[PDB]
Design a protein around this nucleic acid. Structure first.
Lengths: 150, 157, 240, 193
RNA sequence: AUUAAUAGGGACGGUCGGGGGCAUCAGUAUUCAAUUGUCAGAGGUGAAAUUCUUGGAUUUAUUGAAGACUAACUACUGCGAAAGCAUUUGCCAAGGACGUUUUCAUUAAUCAAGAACGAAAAACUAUGCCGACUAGGGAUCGGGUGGUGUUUUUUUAAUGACCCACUCGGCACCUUACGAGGAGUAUGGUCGCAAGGCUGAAACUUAAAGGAA
């Protein structure tokens, strides 16, 4: 796909073939699960939960070791977010840039980058509203998101 | 451009340097500069209205001689182009068939026995490549396939 | 307007009878260089009046002379460098100069500049212990190893910025740890640039390294005891 | 005593290692010693103890300048003569649009090289367009003419005008803003939502 | 209560750039001035002239200010959506690629309309078949992995350069495989043009003055 830009990059994490446990893993599913909800109570996003659990404790993937993906484990534990993390990071990016512009009124490139970021925000919000994970009247607006961050 | 003599002097700039190593004027010019440049003007004036073979026929040189000449010459052209391209010097451009014209070819007069370029490769390139025999005459072939219009589906339903 | 065709201008209307004989009225003063140098003796300079002892002294306080480090320092390679010496004391047919600045020469700069390699330029403003304010410019070109096959050796700008910050640190710690004679004696035999090379060989090996230019900007209140001490008062002889 | 040094790149290293013996016999005709460094890539000219032309040290300096600017050796020794000087003309800072700049440089060289060659004949010079520097050689009046025409070619006068002018001269001499962008038009689907 | 696309996002990681914003710092020249010398010319040009000069121009010396620009390094290049961008050190955000046994799960591709950004005396001999498209080849810039020795240095700070094998992705160049009127002449027409009595001097044989001889 690759809009907005000029690169055609393919740099992804390729998932290994077999959907079974590694032969050396020796922990227990509930131990991993309580670890995950511990990290959630610390307050980390699922991306970071996975990268901590891969780095330190030696988990390949939650769906590999435990029976389920991370945020359904979260929802089984009542740890759901308001708005999903990629939307959240996008909105943070857009409003942060907006503050930067309000400071520096003569940034044509930042104006252009704001337009591109909000374009992504509209597309993503439309899909989320389509599948109905957001309220159908969810409106991304400047001061609304600004006070959401504030 | 509508002038007749500046632009003539621009065109035989090279011969004059070559054969008088000023006398651009055509009534003090002398010697092989006079001879060759007259051959030049006559060829241009006749070239706009004569037929391509008879306006530039080549003198007859046997095969291994002419192939040898063109080979040695192309090595000299590429040496020139390499030396300039390295120690970056601009060079005038040539339509990629044609042999680039340099001071050695103006001196040796090697164009009368080499030609402008290899005519067989010229003609064979300027032909257009031949299409197949064409078959399925109902729709348009796209990247996706045969798009077959509703009107045509109607007319042969 | 020399010749007979050349017309008069406003020009040659009221002239001056040149009678004064300036090179009768003038006077010759010998100058001399500080003690950090080998060939101390150099140069004789003129003073536009003799009949001012103090007026003559004013002219010779004003002066600035500059000279090739070769003949200043014995080694008869004109070592492509200049020392500006400033005259700031007078005593009896002797001017007691002092260091004023330094430069390379443009032919030496052309002699180092090369095409497939980048140059690095640092320019740090510092203060000596004698409260002089200096601006030192240091130059260095990157080089290819004793091994390469690639045809050109360019430095990635991380390496350039770390080299520029390193050069800055060595210059400012060395000259703030100097006094001005201590500097001059450091600068003469080129020991700073060995310090630079030995401290930057861990980044991206440079070849051609120099202290290009030194600019003086500030001097303190003048110091007779210090200057005459740096070079190293007298009975008359009884006209009757 | 005095000496001048310059540096050359490796293609000129192979060529120079051929032509060097003619350089040392020409400069020793003028009494100037010289040395080539393939180790560092430099060329050095020194006066010797038996020389007496203090101008020839400057001219021979400029000889090695030309040879490492890749002007061949016959045109080098024409710098060694007396009424010839070389010149480097800067053309880097005349326009910003790079397409426009390349077009104007190629306007100076012209079809088959004709305008460059015709200036070469009418001014007795030897011109070499490189990159951003047009390096010419020739008698001083030739250099006056070249500087005028190359400069106004990089500005917007056609060199063919300056060629016509030179030819005639020679004949006669014989005689609101906001940064915050507007909103986005909604899609039909999200309107239905 | 599906798979995790050499489909798309998003996170993280170390980087990379002459991408942008405000701020800073530096460079020689040029212009202006103060101060200093010396003496009559300087500048400019096919040749000169206008112009500046015995209240000292040009020239030399020490300094000061002022606005611009960022040399040589500068390309076989780099970054940018395009116009475009070049000394330092900060700061503010943003970005591509690469790495990844992270995360979401079709969130998508091309676009008429519509919105953002877009110096603007200019232009003036260039020109290449294309395509949904097969293998390559040499150098190049950015990241990653192995091998390996030299450059490197050793308990306190950077553990970076080069050579080689691959390998993703870039601006490129060199090779390949298959494929859908012009030029000229004539012209009892129409319109437009167009001629000469030496002038003076024409109702006057008409003077003076010339022009030819």
């Amino acid at each position: 796909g690759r809009m907005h830009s000029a690169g055609k990059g393919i740099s992804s994490s390729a998932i290994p073939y077999s959907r079974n446990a590694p032969a050396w893993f020796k922990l227990s599913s509930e131990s991993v699960i309580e670890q995950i909800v511990k990290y959630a109570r610390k307050g980390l996003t699922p991306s970071q939960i996975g990268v901590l659990l891969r780095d330190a404790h030696g988990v390949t993937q939650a769906r590999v070791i435990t029976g389920n993906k991370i945020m359904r484990i979260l929802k089984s534990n009542g740890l759901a977010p308001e708005i999903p993390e990629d939307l959240y990071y996008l909105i943070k990016k857009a409003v942060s840039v907006r503050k930067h512009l309000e400071r520096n009124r003569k940034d044509k490139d930042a104006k252009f980058r704001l337009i591109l970021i909000e374009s992504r925000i509209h597309r993503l919000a439309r899909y989320y509203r389509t599948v109905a994970v957001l309220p159908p009247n969810w409106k991304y607006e400047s001061a609304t998101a600004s006070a959401l961050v504030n | 451009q509508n002038d007749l003599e500046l632009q003539q002097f621009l065109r035989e700039s090279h011969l004059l340097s070559a054969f008088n190593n000023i006398v651009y004027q055509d009534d003090q010019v002398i010697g092989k500069a006079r001879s060759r440049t007259l051959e030049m003007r006559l060829n241009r004036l006749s070239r706009v209205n004569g037929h391509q073979d008879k306006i530039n026929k080549l003198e007859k040189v046997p095969m291994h001689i002419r192939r040898g000449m063109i080979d040695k010459h192309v090595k000299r052209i590429k040496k020139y182009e390499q030396e300039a391209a390295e120690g970056g010097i601009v060079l005038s451009k040539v339509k990629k068939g044609q042999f680039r014209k340099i001071e050695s070819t103006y001196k040796k007069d090697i164009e009368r026995r080499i030609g402008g370029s290899i005519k067989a490769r010229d003609k064979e390139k300027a032909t257009k490549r031949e299409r197949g025999l064409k078959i399925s005459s109902v729709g348009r072939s796209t990247r996706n396939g045969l798009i077959v219009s509703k009107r045509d589906i109607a007319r042969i339903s | 307007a020399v010749g007979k065709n050349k017309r008069l201008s406003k020009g040659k209307k009221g002239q001056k009878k040149r009678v004064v004989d300036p090179f009768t009225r003038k006077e010759w003063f010998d100058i001399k260089a500080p003690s950090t140098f080998e060939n101390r003796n150099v140069g004789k300079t003129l003073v536009n009046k003799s009949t001012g002892l103090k007026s003559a002294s004013d002219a010779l306080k004003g002066r600035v002379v500059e000279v090739c480090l070769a003949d200043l320092q014995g080694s008869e390679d004109h070592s492509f460098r200049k020392i500006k010496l400033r005259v700031d004391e007078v005593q009896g047919k002797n001017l007691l100069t002092n260091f004023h600045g330094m430069d390379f020469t443009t032919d030496k700069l052309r002699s180092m500049v090369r095409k497939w390699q980048t140059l690095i330029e640092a320019n740090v403003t510092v203060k000596t212990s004698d409260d002089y304010v200096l601006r030192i410019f240091a130059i260095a070109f990157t080089r290819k190893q004793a091994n390469q096959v690639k045809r050109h050796s360019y430095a990635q700008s991380s390496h350039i910025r770390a080299i520029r910050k390193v050069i800055s640190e060595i210059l400012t710690k060395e000259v703030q740890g100097s006094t001005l004679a201590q500097l001059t004696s450091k600068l003469i035999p080129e020991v700073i640039n060995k310090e630079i090379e030995n401290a930057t060989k861990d980044i991206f090996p440079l070849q051609n390294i120099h202290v290009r230019k030194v600019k003086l900007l500030k001097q303190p209140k003048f110091d007779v005891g210090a200057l005459m001490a740096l070079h190293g008062e007298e009975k008359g002889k009884k006209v009757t | 005593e005095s000496s001048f040094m310059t540096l050359f790149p490796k293609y000129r290293e192979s060529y120079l290692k051929t032509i060097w013996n003619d350089v040392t016999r020409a400069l020793d005709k003028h009494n100037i010693a010289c040395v080539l460094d393939l180790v560092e890539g430099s060329m050095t000219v020194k006066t010797t103890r038996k020389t007496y032309d203090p101008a020839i040290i400057l001219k021979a300096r400029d000889l090695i300048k030309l040879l490492a600017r890749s002007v061949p050796f016959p045109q080098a020794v024409k710098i060694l003569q007396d009424d010839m000087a070389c010149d480097v003309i800067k053309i880097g800072n005349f326009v910003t649009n790079k397409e426009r700049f390349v077009k104007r440089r190629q306007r100076l060289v012209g079809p088959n090289g004709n305008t460059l060659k015709a200036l070469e004949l009418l001014t007795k010079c030897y011109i070499l367009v490189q990159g951003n520097t047009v390096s010419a050689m020739g008698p001083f009046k030739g250099l006056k003419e070249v500087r005028r025409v190359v400069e106004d070619c990089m500005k917007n006068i056609h060199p063919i005008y300056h060629i016509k002018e030179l030819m005639i001269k020679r004949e006669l001499a014989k005689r609101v803003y906001t940064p915050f962008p507007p909103a986005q038009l909604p899609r039909k689907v999200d309107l239905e939502i």
